[PDB]
Design a protein around this ligand. Structure first.
Ligand SMILES: CC(=O)N[C@@H]1[C@@H](O)[C@H](O[C@@H]2O[C@H](CO)[C@@H](O)[C@H](O)[C@H]2NC(C)=O)[C@@H](CO)O[C@H]1O
Ligand SMILES: CC(=O)N[C@@H]1[C@@H](O)[C@H](O[C@@H]2O[C@H](CO)[C@@H](O)[C@H](O)[C@H]2NC(C)=O)[C@@H](CO)O[C@H]1O
Lengths: 858, 858
């Protein structure tokens, strides 16, 4: 009853990693069904400061990105619901949570959990008809309340992991090659770096305002510029320092004759921006804005520049489906994107755990798909996921909200690319359409109920997606109703784009991995075990839709060759619908198009691919084939531009890490997207090891670059901003500028990490030093003004001769230190290092002095 | 002597624009007498690869649409003869064209010359009794032989010109909103769009021929249909797919009860056409024909349609006077007109530089008026004009040729409307009648000599027409002999119409601007200069006929109020003669009727007006008054339907451009003729700027739409066809169909370009996309079969990711590209874009693969 839920809600949870490499230390992970025989042991401790909890009629629900394989306290048992949702229950041996006692429940989980952020908050208790209530100490974003610190080598994935744990001591080394440059050494440095620029000794003076001739821009775009001068402290007045604008395409030739190109002259009494087009004028103005200093001095260098995109597609991807992000955060994101010339906003509006766009005619997509709550019947919500608690959690963009975002993006030269995943990663749609089916069927409106249904009633397939959902994660690609659904959705969103003044150019249909993970290579069948693989019963595992009778008949009539080809087939069909709706470009994650012959297989005249192989797994060679088959490659490599991954290897950092252990501003910046093999000399793999890379194939070139904020653990808007910024500035730099150290691709050139010296690292490090300093001494202050909760890097620090030496990943940022265990903080001055003894802590401070990085012991 | 002419003929001319905005860069254009103080500087270079040319007894004649105001090489001087004819001569300082030297002669000309087509070919040399010989490198239609390319911003009319120069790069953008539609998306699409239509899933099969029941049509009309099925590859056999026809007016009601209306049913085994009248049956058959595909498949969609004219008058105007166009080209034009339901052929048979209709009794009109040759005495020819060389150039339709054309038009439901200009634009008649006078006077037949004379012997008026002719361009409206001439001409042409079986319904008397341009607002008098105007001596400038003593006496007796009213008076008098000849409708360009009280002032029961004001000069408001005064408005706006203007803003394109800088298929199609103000949201003005439009007056509606091919620079038949087609298809569409995006006119509604959003642009663009695709994938192939040398649009192209992306104004057309500077050409395939580096050129190809657009560098 409710009293039982009450008692359980007051149990205090503690989560403690015991062994991240349990298979290396005896546990038979293979027998437990762990992928590649890899598993970890964790201790869940439930402490009871109240009276005995002896009731047996209860379930405790919790979330985890890892499956639970074994429970080592025989009073309890754990089962999986679907996705990340699990349940802990008493067994027949349960004898209660004794008064004033801590109950230990050791468990084994698949893989490893290398960051504390793996452990999700908001466990909750239930009991016959009572209402669900969270275990209170878990109702928080502060992991310290319920997750013990990692100790020793618990951060290591394997005994041979070569990654470097970051602490003040090791981080000092990681930063040592850097230094703070004098303001005089950073004059006329536009970000992103301009193609050609000549800075002159003198500075224009903008302190008395500027006179802006913005007649070349449509009003909304002009307003964006005017407002940014004001945000940056530069008055806009008719008697200010002139800034003239003009548009003349003919003035541009060759590679410079492209949208966004401009010519810029900053003189000591006036300024001039000549654009290839409106975007070019706009970017020319952003460059002037990038020079505005953070000291309010208003002085910028006189200079002469010519500038143009290396790539037409400079993207930022944002997942609002796993966890929602409010309209105001999207707008802030779009503001910074404009500031750094990123022009493409790839909007991941649906996935298995949420559907975030209102669709006229299909209310259930947002009424049910737009929220998660504990309703085991998923009639009013999707099941809870991602540690947001058992109560209703969610949100979605109204039709007006969405039109508003498109207008906002467009004023800023950013194109909105809507992504609606299918056939995989569609659980929100499927479950919502099942609720619609059920509701309309109840009223006896069977044709209306079946109009948009995404389930084949006959399908009993047994498949598991990458996030551990079942067949409901997959929309059925063989139903006429599924095509009615896709048509309806494209139709509705395209109309919003037309009303917002930016007709869709590209439709992104997802195309994520649509396979049953239980048939993957790391699992083995129980009949005949092969060592080192997770032993499971594969005799009832199917391929997606294998038991769908509609698909079976579709194959039989000759529409599709077999079940394996359904995903490919579905992508060709979506392309027809995209085209039928007047959209002539389609885009997808690579898996959704791999089985296609080439780009000629699609109805649209252009097909883009979000290339997401890692390099250490051969992505430096598989990328080629995509361009050579006629697809436009949007470089989206997870080992460099997945912004849901950690900034640094430290178990207190946020992020998933399946593709690599960390990607900091420096790493993102060091990535050479158009000569993938060269990255072997400038980066290490997921385990910190050197790798080699070479391709013998032709490489026509990449179409664009895109960085991704997936949102599994970015539960709040602040967390989203911490993960995106400031590394998205590095993304903008590389997306816009081809550096000298980025070599032309050479078929047959083999780069060997730690062995070959083809790459001009001297030039790379100098470029990075200057960029880091621009971020530290100037741009982060602008991010402050923008209201984005960017990540402040923790200092690097060491004690030598009894004094503190500190350094930072983004030189220019203030560093503070504390000798009293963090009670009182003092400014660190490099040219007057402090004498210290005993425990010392360090932290960095934002330019406006209001925010701090986390603090760490030296 | 002849040796001198020989030497000069071998000089090689080069024409190079130096400054199209000379007045903005210091030249005092006002002082030079330039209209509105606007002038341009051009370099004429004469290169001599032979021995020295030191003779002084020579004149070099050349043509230009602009007057020469100054010569900046004091060895030479230039004078104007009349019209476009000028002469370059040595001065007393001339010291010869040195051997192996290029002589530079910079000149200043009035206005601007924005297209290379402004410069006319066939300069020629003369010298005492020798025979005239052209400078050989100028004897060509290929401007590249003697006119340098334009560079930089030489295409701009003013420093603020906002037009967009079209190059592959900018044209790609201009075309980007378009795409190629799948054949399946273009089923049952009749052109022009039918009023009501319902397409069904199935296709009739015409590959085995059709069985045509054409008993509803008179033989000649039936033959036209039979032949078109054959041209389009559809056999006509008694055992083919039936196509029945019937005429029943009663079957039509309301707006649909009009000539040309029909009902059409296309079934899978037979077809049915029910016409309001013969024209309606004929149009019903053209609609079936419009559906015949270009793949020879013979498949057309089953459908049910109701269709009728929005306007009774759907005109194509053709000038054969400035430059002649052969009977075969007129016939081809009439063929295409029938195909697209255009039913009115406005035949501009006379003007100042030619008279093209044989008139029994007045042989001099064609013997002298029908040819131009270098005879300074204009006894056997009119003076040379329009760069056709010094030898005899011309032609004219015999009485039989003309009767033949009328018969041909009539079989095709097209009415021939003859235009004989007067009182202005009559130099051919005046000079021919002066030669008749002189000849008959020589024989002592003074009454015969004076019978048809168009000159008052006493008239010493000093006036200048728009094309820079003097008083001989104006027939004298006060002479009895002039009325004898007009009566004779109407009498003779009306009889041809009766013999051809199509009695004239409308007589068009021209009524072009009959004023002395030297008294216009842009000129000022030298006594008292006002700034910004061309300074001239206006003390000897008169109004037309001011010095005619016959007119002075006509005014004195009370027949006409003053000289200013002579043109108005003459139009009332012509109306009496038109009526006396049994013609009950008269038509004119607006200026010829503006001074009239209203339509009640004319003898005919109907008076039409070719409305030709531009919209940005207030035509959206002045049009109203014409209908409200009882005239039938034939919309002929030069800013949209003057087909002598350029398809696109590029200095290598052909066309005059005084009313607007370009009118492409899209623009013609976007024109809303019956709600003129709405064009403010869908077009820009002559300088590429937005304009506003609103009328508060009543607007009963337009009578018709007419597109005009004036022929100053359309020197050949091919050029005539390039200028008419394919934009005349857009003309036919709009002349026949009122689109949904064409709003009802609303008094007081102010459309503001770039500000108001009243017009459904979404619907306009979708309509245009479909139309463009119909032209590209189907109709242009028919134009090929028709033998018309239509204009092929140059591709739009860009390079991204190192691959070529190309697009086209008329989707469906093949695109080719060259990477070897145009030596070898390859087909462009959108779904397999080519990897390119360095210089790339693009061109489009006609559906039959035999013709190409001009090529341009990407
Ligand atoms: C717990 C964990 O790390 N699971 C991995 C998945 O996150 C990952 O899925 C891909 O990466 C994104 C997270 O970075 C996912 O949000 C997204 O669904 C998916 N990306 C695409 C394009 O499908 C998969 C990749 O195989 O690996 C898991 O182990
Ligand atoms: C060189 C030039 O552009 N001159 C213009 C004249 O062509 C133009 O005359 C009108 O336009 C037609 C050409 O489009 C002429 O052939 C025709 O004589 C005349 N049309 C009518 C109905 O009279 C005049 C218009 O004012 O402008 C000149 O600048």
């Amino acid at each position: 009853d409710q009293q039982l839920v009450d008692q359980l809600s007051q149990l205090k949870l503690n989560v403690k990693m015991l062994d991240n490499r349990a298979g290396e230390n005896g546990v038979d992970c293979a027998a437990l069904g762990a992928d590649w025989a890899s598993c970890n042991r964790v201790l869940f401790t439930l402490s009871n400061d109240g009276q005995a909890i002896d009731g047996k009629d209860w379930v405790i629900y919790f979330h985890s990105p890892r499956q639970t394989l074994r429970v080592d306290n025989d009073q309890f048992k754990i089962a999986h619901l679907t996705g990340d949702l699990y349940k802990l229950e008493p067994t027949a041996k349960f004898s209660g949570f004794p008064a004033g006692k801590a109950v230990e429940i050791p468990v084994v989980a698949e893989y490893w959990q290398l960051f504390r952020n793996d452990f999700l908050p908001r466990w909750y208790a239930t009991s016959g008809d009572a209402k669900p209530k969270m275990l209170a100490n878990t109702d928080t974003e502060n992991l310290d309340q319920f997750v013990a610190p990692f100790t020793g080598d618990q951060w290591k994935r394997t005994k041979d992991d070569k990654n470097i744990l970051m602490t003040p001591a090791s981080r000092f080394v990681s930063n040592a090659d850097l230094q703070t440059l004098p303001a005089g050494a950073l004059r006329g440095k536009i970000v992103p770096t301009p193609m050609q620029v000549k800075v002159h000794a003198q500075d224009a003076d903008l302190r008395k305002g500027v006179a802006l001739d913005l007649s070349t821009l449509v009003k909304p775009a002009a307003d964006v510029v005017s407002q940014r001068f004001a945000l940056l402290g530069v008055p806009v007045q008719t008697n200010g320092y002139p800034i003239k604008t003009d548009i003349q395409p003919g003035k541009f030739k060759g590679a410079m004759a492209v949208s966004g190109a401009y010519e810029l002259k900053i003189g000591k009494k006036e300024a001039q921006v000549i654009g290839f087009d409106q975007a070019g004028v706009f970017y020319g103005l952003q460059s002037i804005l990038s020079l505005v200093p953070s000291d309010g001095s208003g002085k910028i260098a006189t200079l002469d520049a010519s500038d143009a995109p290396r790539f037409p597609y400079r993207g930022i991807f944002l997942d609002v489906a796993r966890n929602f992000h409010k309209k105001d955060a999207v707008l802030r994101l779009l503001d910074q994107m404009a500031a750094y010339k990123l022009n493409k906003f790839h909007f991941h509006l649906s996935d298995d755990e949420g559907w975030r766009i209102e669709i006229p005619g299909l209310p259930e997509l947002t009424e049910v798909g737009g929220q998660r709550c504990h309703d085991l019947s998923e009639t009013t919500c999707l099941l809870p996921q991602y540690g947001q608690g058992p109560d209703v959690y969610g949100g979605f963009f109204s039709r007006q909200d969405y039109i508003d975002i498109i207008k906002y993006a467009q004023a800023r030269q950013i194109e909105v690319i809507p992504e609606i995943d299918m056939p995989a990663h569609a659980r929100a749609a499927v479950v919502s359409m099942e609720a619609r089916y059920k509701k309309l069927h109840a009223a006896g409106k069977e044709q209306e109920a079946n109009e948009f249904r995404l389930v084949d009633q006959t399908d009993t397939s047994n498949t598991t997606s990458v996030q551990f959902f079942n067949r409901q994660s997959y929309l059925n690609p063989c139903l006429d109703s599924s095509q009615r659904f896709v048509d309806k959705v494209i139709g509705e969103i395209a109309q919003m784009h037309k009303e917002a003044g930016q007709p869709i150019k590209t439709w992104h249909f997802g195309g994520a991995e649509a396979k049953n993970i239980r048939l993957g290579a790391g699992y083995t069948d129980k009949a005949k075990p092969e060592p080192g693989k997770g032993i499971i019963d594969q005799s009832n595992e199917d391929k997606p839709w294998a038991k769908s009778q509609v698909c079976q008949t579709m194959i039989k009539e000759g529409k599709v060759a077999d079940m394996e080809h359904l995903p490919s087939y579905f992508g060709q069909e979506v392309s027809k619908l995209v085209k039928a709706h007047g959209i002539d470009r389609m885009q997808a994650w690579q898996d959704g198009l791999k089985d296609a012959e080439s780009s000629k297989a699609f109805a649209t005249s252009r097909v883009g691919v979000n290339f997401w192989d890692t390099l250490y797994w051969g992505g430096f060679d598989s990328v080629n084939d995509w361009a050579n088959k006629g697809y436009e490659v949007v470089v989206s490599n997870p080992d460099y531009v997945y912004m849901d991954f950690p900034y640094e290897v430290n178990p207190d950092e946020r992020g998933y890490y399946w593709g690599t252990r960390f990607s900091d501003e420096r790493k993102v910046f060091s990535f050479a997207p158009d000569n993938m093999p060269q990255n072997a000399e400038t980066s290490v793999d997921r385990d910190g090891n050197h790798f080699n890379a070479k391709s013998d194939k032709p490489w026509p070139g990449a179409y664009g670059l895109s960085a991704q904020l997936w949102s599994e653990t970015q539960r709040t808007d602040p967390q989203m901003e911490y993960m995106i910024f400031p590394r998205a500035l590095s993304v903008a730099e590389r997306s816009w500028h081809r550096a000298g150290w980025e070599q032309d691709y050479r078929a047959g050139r083999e780069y060997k990490g730690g062995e070959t010296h083809f790459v001009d690292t001297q030039a790379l490090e100098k470029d990075w030093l200057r960029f880091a300093n621009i971020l530290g001494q100037r741009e982060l202050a602008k991010l402050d003004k923008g209201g984005v909760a960017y990540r402040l890097p923790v200092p690097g620090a060491r004690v030598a001769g009894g004094k503190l030496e500190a350094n930072i990943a983004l030189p220019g940022l203030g560093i503070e230190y504390s000798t009293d265990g963090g009670k009182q903080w003092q400014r660190y001055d490099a040219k007057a290092k402090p004498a210290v003894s005993g425990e010392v802590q360090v932290r960095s401070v934002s330019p406006d002095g209001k925010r701090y990085s986390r603090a760490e012991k030296v």
